[PDB]
Design a protein around this motif. Structure first.
Motif, short mmCIF file in Angstrom:
data_model
loop_
_atom_site.label_atom_id
_atom_site.label_comp_id
_atom_site.label_asym_id
_atom_site.label_seq_id
_atom_site.Cartn_x
_atom_site.Cartn_y
_atom_site.Cartn_z
N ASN A 60 118.86 38.04 44.82
CA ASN A 60 117.75 38.96 45.15
C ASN A 60 116.47 38.52 44.45
N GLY A 61 115.34 38.73 45.11
CA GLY A 61 114.06 38.29 44.57
C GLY A 61 113.17 37.75 45.67
N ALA A 62 112.45 36.67 45.38
CA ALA A 62 111.58 36.05 46.37
C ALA A 62 112.37 35.09 47.24
N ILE A 63 113.39 34.48 46.65
CA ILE A 63 114.24 33.55 47.36
C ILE A 63 115.26 34.30 48.20
N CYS A 64 115.25 34.05 49.50
CA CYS A 64 116.16 34.72 50.42
C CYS A 64 117.45 33.93 50.61
N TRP A 65 117.47 32.73 50.03
CA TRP A 65 118.62 31.82 50.11
C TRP A 65 118.85 31.37 51.54
N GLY A 66 117.76 31.17 52.26
CA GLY A 66 117.85 30.72 53.63
C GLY A 66 117.23 29.36 53.81
N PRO A 67 117.81 28.50 54.67
CA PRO A 67 117.24 27.19 54.99
C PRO A 67 115.81 27.30 55.49
N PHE A 80 110.55 36.17 55.21
CA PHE A 80 109.74 35.85 54.05
C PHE A 80 108.33 35.46 54.47
N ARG A 81 108.22 34.71 55.56
CA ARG A 81 106.93 34.23 56.04
C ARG A 81 106.14 35.36 56.67
N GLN A 82 106.85 36.32 57.25
CA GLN A 82 106.23 37.48 57.87
C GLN A 82 105.67 38.41 56.80
N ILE A 83 106.30 38.39 55.63
CA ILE A 83 105.84 39.19 54.51
C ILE A 83 104.73 38.45 53.77
#
Length: 30
Positions: free
Chosen positions: A1-8, A13-16
């Protein structure tokens, strides 16, 4: 949890993380 979504390629995240409503030209002069 945090800024890293753990996604490739995190899309949500970019929408936010978007500050394109900022006026570069206006802030450049003023």
């Amino acid at each position: 949890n945090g800024a890293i979504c753990w996604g490739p390629c995190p899309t949500a995240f970019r929408q936010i993380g978007n500050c394109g409503r900022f006026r570069v030209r206006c802030c450049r002069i003023r």
